[PDB]
Amino acid sequence: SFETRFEKMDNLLRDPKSEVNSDCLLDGLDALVYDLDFPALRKNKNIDNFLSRYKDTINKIRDLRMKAEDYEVVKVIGRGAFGEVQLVRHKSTRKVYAMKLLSKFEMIKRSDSAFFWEERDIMAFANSPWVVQLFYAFQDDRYLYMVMEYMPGGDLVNLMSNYDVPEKWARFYTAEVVLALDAIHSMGFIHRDVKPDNMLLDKSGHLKLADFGTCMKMNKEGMVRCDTAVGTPDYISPEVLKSQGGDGYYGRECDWWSVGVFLYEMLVGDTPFYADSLVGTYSKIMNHKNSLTFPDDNDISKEAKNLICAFLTDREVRLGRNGVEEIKRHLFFKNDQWAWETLRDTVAPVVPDLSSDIDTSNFDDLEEDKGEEETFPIPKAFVGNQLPFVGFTYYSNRRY
Amino acid sequence: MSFETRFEKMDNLLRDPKSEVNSDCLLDGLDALVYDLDFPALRKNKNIDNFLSRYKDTINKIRDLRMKAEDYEVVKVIGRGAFGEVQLVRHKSTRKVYAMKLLSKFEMIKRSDSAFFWEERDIMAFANSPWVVQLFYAFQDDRYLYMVMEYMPGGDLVNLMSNYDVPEKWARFYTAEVVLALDAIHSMGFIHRDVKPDNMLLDKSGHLKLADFGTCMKMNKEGMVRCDTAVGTPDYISPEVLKSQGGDGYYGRECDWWSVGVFLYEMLVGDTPFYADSLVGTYSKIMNHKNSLTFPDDNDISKEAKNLICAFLTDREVRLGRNGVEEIKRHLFFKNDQWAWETLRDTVAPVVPDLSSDIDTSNFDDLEEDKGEEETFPIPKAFVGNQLPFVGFTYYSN
Ligand SMILES: Cc1cncc2cccc(S(=O)(=O)N3CCCNC[C@@H]3C)c12
Ligand SMILES: Cc1cncc2cccc(S(=O)(=O)N3CCCNC[C@@H]3C)c12
């Protein structure tokens, strides 16, 4: 019909998940103008006319869309591999966020993933108390921007470094991680990178999973086919570490192995497979059968040792293989202060004491500025470097 | 300005029909970029190959839902333009009848002329005047631009002048309707620059509308325009525009009234006042208008008609219409006892067309057969950009 078509079209223009909604269409034009405004291409008639035809229109567009100078930087609080994360306040709304930056030139310069899509999709739609929420995402010719909620409590690395964690606490944080990963699994994802660095606490002291740069979608059988290893040297599982072209076909059990490494560190004080070098940890992990030993100290309860061992073993025997419910039924979690279905409603072991909306005490000092980072080379001919990052924007068509 | 304001100002721009960043214009820019990149030589670049591979399923579906050419059923060819034919069509779904104009993209690029359609698209779409032919829809593909307009069943004034010896009473009516039609186009801020019977069409009631505006321009601060172009049909073109060969000339809107004087002269005498065999001879007679403008040895033309034709066919600085349009209306030639200006298009027309159906094309002569195969674009080796001058043309109505 003539109306059914006009309707179907209006869906693809509004739906927050359309490949061509207002966010994607306003980006596509913004990408073209950016990737044409070079004197070596201005010699072409069509390009020179097009840029002069849209010059006044495109400068009005960029002044109205969300841009970097809309935010007031307060302090740098994190360093990612591709860009820093800074505590900012929106100049107009006065609201405080944690803004993440991603250098476009850097990611294009050999980072075989285009990973930002998976993290943008989860943090924006997950709608879970265990997942850090993405509020806005925008871009320009240099960086990608991810405006997320600020976690004032800090990461679990900072907590472990300033405390000797007792079992009561370890039980709480391990249980909150288990529910956090089960929520990510329900979305159809294997995390592949579970570690304290990616765990942050809110203003109440409860745990959330920040960063999802290594998340991948499971198939119908619930497995993942990968030819290259992914993760962190200490927390990586035996099957993900030996990932090769011969197969490389693992399930979600690898995530629970990392939770066992996480529990071991909170009690013992060190990683279960520490070494003098980095490549030593590798041999120690592949030989987990004989290398996994607890130090001579009576303070690790029988149950704690049992769970850590139930996680740190071969995939086929490893606990958590028959669903997440057999992990929750474990005796280590058997306590008398909370229940699973009401855990994030109970009072946290360490409640943070904050002075203001911008209290950054739980975050160690960084440097700021660094000068100016070099970006893409000025094109001689049409390169089209913004085409990969088209439609990353999350502003005009957000889900409410 | 607040954040709630900045967000909403942006959101309104995607629905505003006058906006250059409206939803249809943004959809054009993506539709275009896929055409001007999908060549096996440019697939070597991965940023392009990856961009095209993502929007495959998507851009194919977009080009399927939007208004396309096969949505209309062609009934008969009724007109021919420089860049493509104009055909009477019926929309297959709504069953409504329109006159659709076609413009070959490749042709406009080849002739180095792809910046005139904007002025006509803007007027016919927003003019909202009984004197202006209305544009309902405008869409495109990789080959032509499309302009869906209201069909004028009355035919052009050329066909009327060829089948009748136009009496003064009629000439008075049609000249007055042109004067009001041009005054409406002037109020929008435009000088027409191309007033002739070919561009005048009658509706089903027999009243005049200006169709085709492919040479209109926006007037500057003093209400004038500086331009430099060639000459197409110099029979109606004024002295000032002819002296503007280069861009050294600044002319006002009084050039449009000169053409109205040529229009009145033709309706009565029977021929153009400065006609010649060659194109350079027509020009020479226009420049020497003080001596070439004459009248036949038959006093069929009244005193008033002679006066008005002379008041229009003189130097710009003395030409009638310089001191506004009101001094033209006050002229004694128009002094009649049939109508008044403010109610003219409500009176009965001198020639009311007799129609048989919604597709009666009797007032339009049959048109040959173009037959000439349209040439296509050669496969690029770099970025050519043969779609950028045609982004933002698509337009829908409510
Ligand atoms: C400090 C911080 C504070 N508040 C919210 C955050 C949301 C995502 C990431 C961070 S972050 O910790 O800056 N961050 C990115 C740097 C790489 N290391 C992983 C880690 C999760 C936040
Ligand atoms: C026949 C016709 C019939 N109905 C509506 C029309 C609207 C615009 C142009 C035409 S048209 O006359 O086809 N036309 C274009 C060809 C060049 N000459 C100018 C003239 C106005 C219409």
Instruction: Kindly write down the DSSP assignment for every residue of B111-164, as one continuous string.
Output: TT--SSHHHHHHHHHH---TTBPPEEEEEE-SSEEEEEE---TTEEHHHHHHHS
Burial of B107 (0-12, 13-18, 19+ CB in 10 A): middle
Residues of B in contact with A13 (CB under 8 A): 14, 23
Taking alpha carbons only, the member of B379, B386, B385, B367 closest to residue B143 is B386
Residues of B in contact with A54 (CB under 8 A): 20
Q: Is A193 a catalytic residue?
A: yes
Taking an 8 Å cut-off on Cβ atoms, the answer to whether B383 and A64 are in contact is no
Pairing, β A84-90 against β A96-103: antiparallel
* Helix residue spans in chain A (DSSP H): 2-11, 22-34, 39-42, 45-64, 104-108, 116-125, 156-162, 167-186, 238-241, 253-268, 278-286, 288-291, 302-311, 325-328
Beta strands, E only, A199-281: 199-201, 207-209, 216-217, 224-225, 249-250
Taking alpha carbons only, the member of A200, A193, A90, A180 closest to residue A138 is A90
Paired residues of A225 in beta bridges: A249
Residue of A89, A150, A200 to mutate, ligand 1, most atoms within 8 A of C-beta: A200
Domains assigned to chain B: 1-155+355-398 (3.30.200.20), 156-354 (1.10.510.10)
Taking alpha carbons only, the member of A208, A285, A300 closest to residue A254 is A285
Taking an 8 Å cut-off on Cβ atoms, the answer to whether B58 and A385 are in contact is no
B81 φ/ψ angles, rounded to the nearest 5 degrees? -105, 180
The alpha carbon of B211 and the centre of ligand 2 are apart by a number of angstroms equal to 6
Long-range contacts of A247-250 (CB under 8 A, 24+ apart): A249/A223, A249/A224, A249/A225, A250/A223, A250/A224, A250/A226, A250/A315
Burial of B372 (0-12, 13-18, 19+ CB in 10 A): exposed
Distance CA A268, CA A276 (A): 18
Binding site membership of B199 for ligand 2 (Cβ less than 6 Å): yes
Q: From residue A345, how far is each of A128, A177, A338, B270 by CA, in Å?
A: 14, 15, 9, 95
Is the dihedral angle over the CA atoms A323, A326, A329, A332 positive or is it negative? Answer: negative
- Residue A292 tokens read as 């996994």
Q: From residue B18, how far is each of A97, A118, A386, B12, B15 by CA, in Å?
A: 36, 37, 28, 11, 9
Distance CA A189, CA A181 (A): 9
Burial of A210 (0-12, 13-18, 19+ CB in 10 A): buried
Question: DSSP labels for A61-77?
Answer: HHHHS--GGGEEEEEEE
User: Which amino acid residue places its CA nearest to atom 5 of ligand 2?
Assistant: B151
Residue of B117, B157, B212, B216 to mutate, ligand 2, most atoms within 8 A of C-beta: B212
